[PDB]
UniProtKB/Swiss-Prot annotation, chains A, B:
Its main location: membrane. One of its GO terms (biological process) is bacterial-type flagellum-dependent cell motility. The basal body constitutes a major portion of the flagellar organelle and consists of four rings (L,P,S, and M) mounted on a central rod. The chain holds residues 117 to 174 of 232 of the full protein. Keywords: Bacterial flagellum, Cell outer membrane, Lipoprotein, Membrane, Palmitate, Signal. It is found in: Cell outer membrane; Bacterial flagellum basal body. The gene is flgH. Assembles around the rod to form the L-ring and probably protects the motor/basal body from shearing forces during rotation. The lineage of its organism: Bacteria, Pseudomonadati, Pseudomonadota, Gammaproteobacteria, Enterobacterales. One of its GO terms (cellular component) is cell outer membrane. This is Flagellar L-ring protein. Belongs to the FlgH family. It comes from Salmonella typhimurium (strain LT2 / SGSC1412 / ATCC 700720). One of its GO terms (molecular function) is cytoskeletal motor activity. The keyword Signal applies.
Length: 58, 58
């Protein structure tokens, strides 16, 4: 060890960060009167309805 | 002792400190409905279940 033959110095680093996300929301707060389309074998009713409103410009 | 023949002075030190540690934790807070795969001899049930959710983009 007379010289710096044994003198040693070293550093090392490794950092990793990963992220991920997702969202999906929906809301509906109306009331619509529909009409029966047909009666199924079990008695369930197929209902279809439509409502058109022309407030102004569309 | 006329000269510094007996005059003496010396110092010495040796300090060592080592440390080590480790941690490992995990948590899981879900609910999943599984289905029986087979019935063992002692009556134990082999249960396997799977649930796939596509929120959006994955
Ligand atoms: O004993 C040896 O082998 C050495 C001592 C150091 O001086 C070393 O650096 C080398 C030098 O390269 C000679 O020129 O020689
Ligand atoms: O009695 C001796 O042997 C000594 C006395 C000191 O003077 C010592 O240092 C030595 C010196 O080297 C002579 O030149 O001689």
């Amino acid at each position: 060890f007379g010289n710096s033959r044994a003198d040693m110095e070293a550093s090392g680093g490794n950092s990793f960060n990963g992220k991920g996300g997702a969202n999906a929301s929906n809301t509906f707060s109306g009331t619509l009167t529909v009409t029966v389309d047909q009666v199924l074998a079990n008695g369930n009713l197929h209902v279809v309805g439509e409502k058109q409103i022309a407030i102004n410009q569309g």
